[PDB]
Design a protein around this ligand. Sequence first.
Ligand SMILES: [Zn+2]
Lengths: 383, 262, 312
Amino acid sequence: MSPEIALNRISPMLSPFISSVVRNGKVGLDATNCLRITDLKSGCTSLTPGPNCDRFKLHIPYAGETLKWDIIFNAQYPELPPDFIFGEDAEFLPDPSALHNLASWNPSNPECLLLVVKELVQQYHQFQCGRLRESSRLMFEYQTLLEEPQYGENMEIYAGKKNNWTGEFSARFLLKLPVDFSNIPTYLLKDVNEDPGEDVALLSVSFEDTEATQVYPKLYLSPRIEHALGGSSALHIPAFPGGGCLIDYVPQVCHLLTNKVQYVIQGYHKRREYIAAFLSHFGTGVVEYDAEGFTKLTLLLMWKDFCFLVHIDLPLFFPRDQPTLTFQSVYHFTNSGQLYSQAQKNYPYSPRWDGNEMAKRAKAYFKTFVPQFQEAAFANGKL
Amino acid sequence: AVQAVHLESDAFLVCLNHALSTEKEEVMGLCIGELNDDIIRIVHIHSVIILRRSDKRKDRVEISPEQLSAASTEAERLAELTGRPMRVVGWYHSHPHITVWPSHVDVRTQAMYQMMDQGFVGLIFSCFIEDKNTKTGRVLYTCFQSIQAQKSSEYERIEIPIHIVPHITIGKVCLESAVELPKILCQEEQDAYRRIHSLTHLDSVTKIHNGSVFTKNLCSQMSAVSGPLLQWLEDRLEQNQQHLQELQQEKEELMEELSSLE
Amino acid sequence: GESTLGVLSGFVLGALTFHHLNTDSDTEGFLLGEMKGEAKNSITDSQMDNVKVVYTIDIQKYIPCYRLFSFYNSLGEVNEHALKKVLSNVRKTVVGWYKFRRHSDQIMTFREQLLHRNLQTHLSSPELVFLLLTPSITTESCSTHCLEHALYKPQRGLFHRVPLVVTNLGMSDQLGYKTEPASCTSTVFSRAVRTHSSQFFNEDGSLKEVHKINEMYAAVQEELKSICQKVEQSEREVEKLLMDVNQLKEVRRTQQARATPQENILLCQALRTFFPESEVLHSCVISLKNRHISPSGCNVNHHVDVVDQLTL
Ligand SMILES: [Zn+2]
């Protein structure tokens, strides 16, 4: 059952907990982001009417994998704490001393279940390490990264059951990278009701051997970041060199991703300064503009009772390349039926200018060039 | 045709205790209740009558119109005693070590009973299912009716939604029905012995052997049925005394809470 | 190599199922009985085995716990009153405990494992059992229901399933009754059987053992009738008292129930914090006629979050 269908079936006294959990999306860092509620049952006499369901199964994405945990409430006793089942992972030993939000269970906070489940995943991480330690060799990396809190404490880990043949272990580390993605721009989705989620960059590293050989790195990006940096298929990553050196590999990807993000957000902020200055100056006659990326603007002006339009197109390399102006007549179209227009790209400009100076020089260029364009449009164009 | 079935847990308990009584044969009984309309045609089952099967054998389950006469007499008696509008509305049998689904013979019998009235419904209880692979036990129940096929005869099954109505406490009717099981078992053994004695010209040591068999059979009946049933009733009386004390404590607590508050 | 069979009576399972079906939620309780150690009296086998032992657990009665968490907290800690409470439920010997979870997988939960271990500790019975029942409905049509039950016991810290059997009349009643006369042309055999027939074959036909057993059965049947009357009266008293308690609970909850802008705050706070002094007058209101601004007082005091750069 999709979440938009499930949130209508849950007992009302319990709906807020699951609502907060779903709306928060993910629990830890997840990577796959495939959070869902699947099996949902009444857990009460079949003749109890209206919204009633309180048992369910939760798919928690964790370290590129998915944990299938059953969670149980009782509708007729909503105040009471939940109960948990960890699917086929019987060996899981959760220390009840670390579950502060479960020890001090309080329906008074709708986030309680989330705070519980979140803490439970923190124990599950540690539990994986307990199994992981029994494989040896790889702790040399875990320990090395644990001594770096900014990476170690923003981390998740998984280790696969022993191979029936050879007895090898598969393992995966997942890291949240500490870069300032806060100024990454937005972009509108088809559904709109969709949420891109927290703008974050996750580094997944997988090992097939019980040693530091044949290692597969992968970089997952929040949809906002992927859209800002021009798509995952348009970015390369340093391949894993060999041996054991995550502490020297992660800083390289962090430095490079920060470089690219700074370049693109600098371009974005300069385009925003341009559009902001041009709005401040000529907003009285704004027609349209790209409020999401600041790559386009379209203004309507009047010269001696004759209307005309100007389209400003800003290139990716805006601070360096000149923005293209396009003057258009509102009365004349050309012989081909297309709109009569003339583009200006070679004109007074300096990349060192700010928004205000560019607006001043643009108004000057308008006053100086509009008569030429209008004479040409009367000479060549047809009504 | 019926559209839903509500069964009083009061009677579901009698049915279940009848089903778990024996694994060596299939057992059967009839279901008394009423037809109702609400929100849809529904059958409310209030009580059941336990019946003795004579022919036995696998899959050969039928109720005699004699048993129907006895059941309709009991239905009228209960309707006058309780003031309820009770008619014989259904039947049930047990499928031990067998899937809960009806056999083609079960469905043909359900159709033969629907010929009386299309409002008749059937129940089936699947008892002890053994599975050392899973090492778990299971017990199921289902309700059904029958429909004439598109082709000649060959009736087909159809499912009926069934729910259990939480009857928080035991009705006396269900106790008076549950205590009939030992009586019926004893009467079955006694009838077997009486039919054995019909050929009076028989060996004396053989009669001693048959008497010993009768005594051993009733000893087994008392050790496995009457004894555990009586233990259950004593345990229930103790449970009810403790529950009465707890509920009296809770009543006094709520009386104090409402007197002191507002 | 040890086995631990679990044993029930049809009626006990029926009573547990009934107590559950009456409860419009999960429920739980304790299982009382006796544990007997027997040495597996090998069948076939040889003098080169390690002869298994069966710890047969006989469940005789159950005590239902009328509310959840009556004897434990969120972390499965039992607390001391729980001991007193299970003693107040005057008892003989505990052997296990049961729980009904409507629609759930047959695998004991986090709380159940911790609680079973804590109960084994506090009751000093490291051979307790856990009876988990999951009732469920199949086919969505609610035409067919399935009650799946299993026993659990700790072994290697992990809990493993244990077999369960329900005692019934079918267990080797083995009706015989030999027909066809074993007639012998023996004068001596006939003379002896006939001489010693009177000794218990009775007079005017019949047999004394038949009547002894019939009288015993009739006595037990009248005992059942009397206990049925007394249980019916106890049930009537329970019904009345329960309706009273439920009415008072309804009154309690009712008495307790009856006894008890859309402006851009973030934008205004960000605008005031980004232009302290200077012009300040910048607000979100303007004159509809001429392009002159109207002032707004805002909240000016709300707690701001995510205060971030205007241009890099
Ligand atoms: Zn059948």
